[PDB]
Symmetry: D2
């Protein structure tokens, strides 16, 4: 393997913004490595994205 | 009717947080009055909610 | 304007699938023409997409 | 522990419908046990829900 681990701070690289903590994972044929990210601005709200859409930040 | 109009600043009342501008509307049998809200923290990201989940703020 | 109107049957052109009825609209700088679509397979569930992601079907 | 495992067929118990396979997991304070579910009707589309919202089916 995984690019990210639980608790890593990540953001969407482009397009619609999203930033916060890795809180989970998923895997489909379309998205064989995906992550759930809890917004650091909006506690409790989670969005899921393919790994290629995300980048780790400090 | 409508409780909110385009551009109103709203937030989710409870549970998962969300806050920003009304940017659209939807209507289903389950949700006969729903709104699209663009996060003020994460430009471009939009989430949809029933009217009862939202409250207007200044 | 609008490409679609309320009640039009549409589907996602590519990637993750989605198909059902137009039930609403939204507009942001990133997505100046977007639509809410209620799944015809999963009543009550709605997802939002830019116009370019959707195509009308009979 | 987990209520469900990868590949279990589940559906939303009430409200907006969703049905398909468990494809992932997430954990937040609001949702300490959550699941990602890929629709069996719309390949590639995934939605996330708390465990209490879901039930396993054959
Ligand atoms: N709104 C959007 O467009 C959007 C997009 C992407 C992600 N999300 C994410 O979805 C999450 C919403 O969080 P939340 O605090 O509102 O809700 P939640 O606690 O994540 O619950 C989600 C939904 O599950 C159902 N549910 C929850 N508890 C249940 C129970 N005990 N029994 C039966 N059904 C139950 C309800 O479904 P019904 O509503 O069908 O009744 C509820 O609205 C956030 O993480 C958000 O980011 C939302
Ligand atoms: N991730 C979540 O859990 C979640 C939950 C609720 C709401 N949302 C919302 O969804 C939005 C995502 O925004 P965004 O900037 O990533 O993407 P977007 O511009 O809103 O595009 C959405 C999706 O539509 C498809 N698409 C876009 N342009 C296309 C084109 N020209 N031709 C064919 N298909 C096209 C792509 O589908 P495919 O990916 O299928 O290729 C793309 O990922 C945000 O407003 C976000 O809040 C996300
Ligand atoms: N799960 C996903 O990943 C995802 C992604 C994209 C779109 N969606 C869409 O989101 C919708 C979920 O439908 P649904 O039947 O579960 O739920 P809903 O009726 O659309 O309610 C959505 C959320 O709004 C809040 N809410 C609703 N009524 C409230 C009230 N009376 N007072 C305070 N808050 C209230 C709850 O928030 P909290 O959960 O914060 O308590 C609830 O989970 C579907 O249309 C689905 O497609 C979900
Ligand atoms: N639309 C909704 O309301 C909603 C609600 C809940 C869940 N969802 C879920 O979100 C998923 C959408 O699937 P999908 O096939 O459209 O898209 P995807 O492959 O899951 O990609 C999601 C988004 O990530 C970004 N992205 C993907 N690849 C990228 C790359 N190589 N570089 C930079 N950014 C990249 C794009 O963001 P941008 O659009 O920001 O450019 C894209 O729209 C489905 O599983 C669906 O159920 C959608």
């Amino acid at each position: 393997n995984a690019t990210f681990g639980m608790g890593d701070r990540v953001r969407k690289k482009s397009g619609a913004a999203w930033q916060g903590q890795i809180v989970g994972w998923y895997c489909t044929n379309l998205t064989p490595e995906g992550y759930a990210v809890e917004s650091e601005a909006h506690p409790g709200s989670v969005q899921i994205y393919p790994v290629a859409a995300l980048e780790r930040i400090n």
